[PDB]
């Protein structure tokens, strides 16, 4: 039984080989259950979907994670765009006889308030219509610590890997 992970940097592990990334290390802690990570850094929601199809047909997963948009407006996307992107997703995931988790994205700064607030309404909106679970974004409440951070503001270093799989387990667990 397959959960594939379909996302950006974020999973893909930004820098850092995706044996080091989370998801490899959500696997090692799981006979149970295999774990494929299908992202790739950078990826729009769109890059998710034209792969999407080939992926389904080559892991045949129960699961799928869904993690994308927060690249979408910096690549010049209309939160729209985002949405009717993530609903293709949503219907292929369903369709391939796999059960759809969405999980919320946060953007990382003001990129002022119409966009910000259509953007963050997307997700409850597609989980709503499509009945699927909204899992909430990586460690939302907590944060992330500034000791795992990399170079830049933005991306956990490998260090933080290994936290980000035990709240990852602890919110799919029931799934």
Same mark, same amino acid.
Request: overall charge neutral; glycine content about 6%.
């Given at each position: 039984?397959?959960?594939?992970?379909?996302?950006?940097?974020?999973?893909?592990?930004?820098?850092?080989?995706?044996?080091?990334?989370?998801?490899?290390?959500?696997?090692?802690?799981?006979?149970?259950?295999?774990?494929? !990570?299908?992202?790739?850094? @950078?990826?729009?929601? /769109? %890059?998710?979907?034209?792969? #999407?199809?080939?992926? $389904?047909?080559?892991?045949?997963?129960?699961?799928?994670?869904?993690?994308?948009?927060? !690249?979408?407006?910096?690549? @010049?996307?209309?939160? /729209? %765009?985002?949405?009717?992107? #993530?609903?293709?997703? $949503?219907?292929?995931?369903?369709?391939?006889?796999?059960?759809?988790?969405?999980?919320?994205?946060?953007?990382?700064?003001?990129?002022?308030?119409?966009?910000?607030?259509?953007?963050?309404?997307?997700?409850?909106?597609?989980?709503?219509?499509?009945?699927?679970?909204?899992?909430?974004?990586?460690?939302?409440?907590?944060?992330?610590?500034?000791?795992?951070?990399?170079?830049?503001?933005?991306?956990?270093?490998?260090?933080?890997?290994?936290?980000?799989?035990?709240?990852?387990?602890?919110?799919?667990?029931?799934?």
């Amino acid at each position: 039984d397959t959960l594939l992970i379909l996302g950006d940097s974020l999973s893909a592990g930004y820098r850092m080989s995706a044996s080091a990334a989370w998801p490899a290390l959500l696997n090692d802690k799981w006979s149970k259950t295999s774990v494929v !990570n299908a992202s790739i850094s @950078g990826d729009t929601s /769109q %890059q998710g979907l034209a792969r #999407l199809p080939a992926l $389904l047909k080559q892991h045949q997963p129960r699961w799928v994670l869904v993690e994308l948009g927060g !690249n979408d407006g910096l690549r @010049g996307f209309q939160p /729209q %765009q985002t949405e009717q992107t #993530l609903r293709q997703i $949503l219907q292929d995931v369903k369709a391939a006889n796999a059960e759809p988790l969405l999980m919320q994205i946060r953007l990382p700064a003001n990129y002022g308030r119409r966009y910000n607030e259509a953007f963050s309404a997307i997700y409850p909106k597609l989980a709503k219509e499509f009945d699927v679970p909204l899992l909430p974004f990586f460690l939302d409440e907590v944060g992330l610590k500034p000791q795992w951070m990399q170079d830049d503001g933005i991306h956990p270093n490998r260090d933080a890997q290994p936290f980000i799989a035990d709240w990852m387990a602890k919110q799919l667990q029931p799934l």
